[PDB]
Design a protein around this ligand. Structure first.
Ligand code: MG
Length: 217
């Protein structure tokens, strides 16, 4: 009777490299380019805000919508090409083990909700997850607690009995702010010290290790 709230990019789905590459493809389509470090700094964060920051324009600039739509096309094609291969090894099996032990599972992603659901459907996450929320599901996205509180409500589990698993500082900040335990993972966008400094209770180095941490309590 406990909840596990999982980030998508860099936690369940091995997408950081594809996100960086497709971001670059989209900027090239828009006739431009930015530093590698700038792109890397955005990986896994909300997409329109990230693209606006890389282009150096207001988020409401029409160039942002153009870039976001092009990104959606390219990323959607990538996800259809990958299917379940989009996920890190052990993810579906791990989620099944958590379900078997009586945990209710949710996704909380900085992707928009429609994209999150489509990815869940193409990878097989959909049959494991009770609730899916994205950046547009709530007024205040990561690092605010709201998304985690919203999915906890969806699960019917009080925040106190939920754990957040993610690879980003925003996930750790979201979980801590929501009054939840946080398991950071080091195989995504963040190193372990940064996650500990952001409030992770522990940091593990693989998804199966995160599952073991939850199962053993
Ligand atoms: Mg992430």
């Amino acid at each position: 009777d406990r909840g596990v709230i999982l980030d998508l990019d860099g936690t369940l789905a091995d997408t950081p490299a594809a996100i960086a590459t497709i971001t670059a493809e989209v900027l090239a389509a828009m006739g431009t380019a930015v530093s590698r470090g700038a792109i890397l700094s955005t990986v896994g964060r909300p997409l329109p805000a990230s693209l606006a920051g890389l282009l150096g324009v207001p988020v409401e600039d029409p160039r942002v919508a153009e870039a976001t739509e092009e990104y959606g096309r390219r990323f959607g094609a990538h996800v259809r090409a990958a299917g379940p291969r989009l996920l890190y090894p052990g993810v579906l099996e791990g989620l099944d083990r958590l379900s078997a032990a009586g945990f209710r599972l949710a996704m909380a992603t900085s992707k928009v909700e429609k994209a999150a659901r489509a990815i869940a459907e193409l990878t097989g996450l959909d049959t494991r997850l009770t609730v899916i929320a994205g950046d547009d599901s709530v007024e205040r996205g990561k690092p605010h607690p709201d998304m985690a509180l919203h999915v906890a409500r969806g699960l019917g589990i009080p925040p106190e009995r939920c754990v957040v698993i993610g690879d980003g500082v925003p996930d750790a900040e979201m979980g801590r702010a929501a009054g939840m335990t946080v398991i950071g993972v080091s195989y995504g966008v963040s190193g372990p010290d940064e996650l500990m400094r952001a409030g992770a209770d522990t940091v593990v180095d693989s998804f199966p290790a995160a599952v073991t941490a939850v199962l053993d309590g």
